[PDB]
Amino acid sequence: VGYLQPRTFLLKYNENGTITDAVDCALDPLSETKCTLKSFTVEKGIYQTS
Amino acid sequence: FELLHAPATVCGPKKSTNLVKNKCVNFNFNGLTGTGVLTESNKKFLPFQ
């Protein structure tokens, strides 16, 4: 039994519209970086969060 | 009543016509209008969408 909480997810659709990956934001410092860039590959360097 | 939030099931006194393809005529599906050529598409959708 679990309760749903309002979070931020980045849905990744394939060639058929099936959700195969979802990255949750507002949890880890690495996940917050991918939330702004809206991508899955983050290069090296310093970035801004909030 | 809401607008553009659920599939058509009420509508009003508007009779449906035929379907013409390969033409840049107007169309209307569940209240949503527009202008474009209705062609073929290899991609498929979902039954609950």
UniProtKB/Swiss-Prot annotation, chain B:
Domain of life: Viruses
Mutagenesis or variant effect for H5P: Increased resistance to human covalescent sera neutralization
Disordered: region residues: 5-27
Subunit structure: Binds to host ACE2. RBD also interacts with the N-linked glycan on 'Asn-90' of ACE2. Cleavage of S generates a polybasic C-terminal sequence on S1 that binds to host Neuropilin-1 (NRP1) and Neuropilin-2 (NRP2) receptors. Interacts with host integrin alpha-5/beta-1 (ITGA5:ITGB1) and with ACE2 in complex with integrin alpha-5/beta-1 (ITGA5:ITGB1). May interact via cytoplasmic c-terminus with M protein. May interact (via N-terminus) with host bilirubin and biliverdin, thereby preventing antibody binding to the SARS-CoV-2 spike NTD via an allosteric mechanism.
Role: Attaches the virion to the cell membrane by interacting with host receptor, initiating the infection. The major receptor is host ACE2. When S2/S2' has been cleaved, binding to the receptor triggers direct fusion at the cell membrane. When S2/S2' has not been cleaved, binding to the receptor results in internalization of the virus by endocytosis using host TFRC and GRM2 and leading to fusion of the virion membrane with the host endosomal membrane. Alternatively, may use NRP1/NRP2 and integrin as entry receptors.
Annotated protein name in UniProt: Spike protein S1
Protein source organism: Severe acute respiratory syndrome coronavirus 2
Lineage: Viruses, Riboviria, Orthornavirae, Pisuviricota, Pisoniviricetes
Residue span relative to the full protein: 515 to 563 of 1273
